[PDB]
Design a protein around this ligand. Structure first.
Ligand code: ACO
Length: 328
């Protein structure tokens, strides 16, 4: 084992290592999937602000005193899994065993932390979209992982220079409803409704958990655009939608989920929300051209509604699991 590679914990206040890790990512992305390039604010931020009720176990591996690879695990409280958020080898040092060594490290950490399975997201090909590097899938299989049975993510791209869903402007707001907007922090009055929109003083635990996500994203320098639909006669939150923007990459943005309350369906609110919030976005983020989103592949309509707005299916986010295995 030892000699060639050194395992070192990745720590936010370690400027040099952190720097070499940002560079590794930058270098890797040049020959990785289609993606917004890593944002350094977002990435250094991901070392200071963890998601709620989640422990981060981050590592770097070195050859000759330099970072040649990285492993980040997310450990959700209570759960028996360890999510592999990053397992990355310098693109000029692949096929020497590093990945294998990182993966043995991941299992040893899962085991130590009382987790029985590792999960990962692996980029693969869509049945008829553009062929993707098969390496990461063959690595996964070779580590002993299996394709899980939860349906994969259909990962889509809208490109505003090839289609403008706003060509006819934003549609008419249906009678009885008004629109509202907010930024990175949910207004006090919609906190509870947002959190319940898709379902005592258990609301506080909920509201507080959501607030930790919102601050995580700000800590990571992300801006966010929300549009809400309100039912005037009841003042109920009928639906909302969002878009997330990293400090980096002025041309890129992330399209979030669109939610519409069960009792307010049938009024094209979903398309209204998407279109109106996009208008909102471009007004403050005029350089945005490339918007990404992802849906459960098994839900064709939601995907279709996105296609109608010009998002095209690009690549496939497949879920894998593996056993942490015995310590003994
Ligand atoms: C669950 C996961 O972690 S999936 C991987 C997620 N990470 C990424 O996609 C990030 C971008 N890619 C990378 O960093 C690298 O391509 C990754 C992580 C494979 C790193 O792998 P490396 O360090 O190059 O591979 P490594 O040398 O450790 O092991 C490869 C073993 O797995 C398989 N394997 C690894 N890469 C490949 C590949 N590109 N094509 C085919 N088989 C591969 C082979 O069986 C290989 O066996 P060995 O050479 O005798 O033949």
């Amino acid at each position: 084992t030892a000699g060639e590679l050194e395992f070192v914990p990745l720590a936010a206040n370690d400027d040099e290592t952190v720097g070499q890790w940002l560079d590794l990512m930058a270098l890797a992305a040049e020959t990785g999937p289609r993606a917004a390039p890593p944002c350094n604010v977002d990435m250094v931020g991901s070392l200071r602000f963890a998601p709620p009720a989640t422990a981060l176990d981050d590592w770097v591996v070195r050859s000759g005193g330099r970072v040649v690879g990285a492993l980040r695990l997310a450990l959700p409280d209570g759960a028996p899994t360890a999510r592999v958020d990053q397992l990355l080898v310098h693109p000029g040092r692949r096929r020497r065993g590093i990945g294998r060594a990182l993966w043995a490290h991941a299992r040893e950490l899962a085991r130590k932390h009382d987790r029985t399975t590792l999960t990962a997201t692996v980029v693969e090909s869509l049945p008829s979209g553009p062929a993707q590097d098969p390496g990461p899938a063959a690595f996964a299989a070779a580590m002993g992982a299996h394709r899980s049975d939860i349906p994969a993510g259909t990962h889509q791209w809208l490109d505003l220079d090839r289609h403008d869903p706003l060509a006819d402007g934003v549609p008419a707001v249906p009678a009885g409803y008004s629109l509202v907007t907010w930024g990175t922090i949910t207004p006090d009055e919609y906190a509870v409704p947002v959190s319940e929109l898709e379902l005592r003083a258990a609301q506080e635990v909920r509201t507080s958990y959501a607030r930790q996500f919102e601050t995580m994203r700000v800590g990571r320098g992300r801006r966010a655009y929300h549009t809400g639909a309100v039912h005037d006669a009841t003042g109920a939150l009928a639906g909302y939608t969002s878009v997330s923007k990293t400090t980096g990459n002025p041309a890129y943005a992330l399209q979030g989920m669109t939610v519409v309350h069960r009792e307010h369906r049938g009024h094209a609110l979903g398309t209204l929300l998407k279109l109106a919030n996009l208008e909102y976005v471009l007004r403050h983020e005029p350089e945005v051209r490339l918007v990404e989103t992802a849906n459960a592949e098994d839900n064709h309509p939601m995907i279709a509604v996105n296609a109608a707005l010009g998002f095209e299916p690009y690549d496939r986010w497949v879920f894998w699991t593996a056993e942490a295995g015995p310590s003994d």
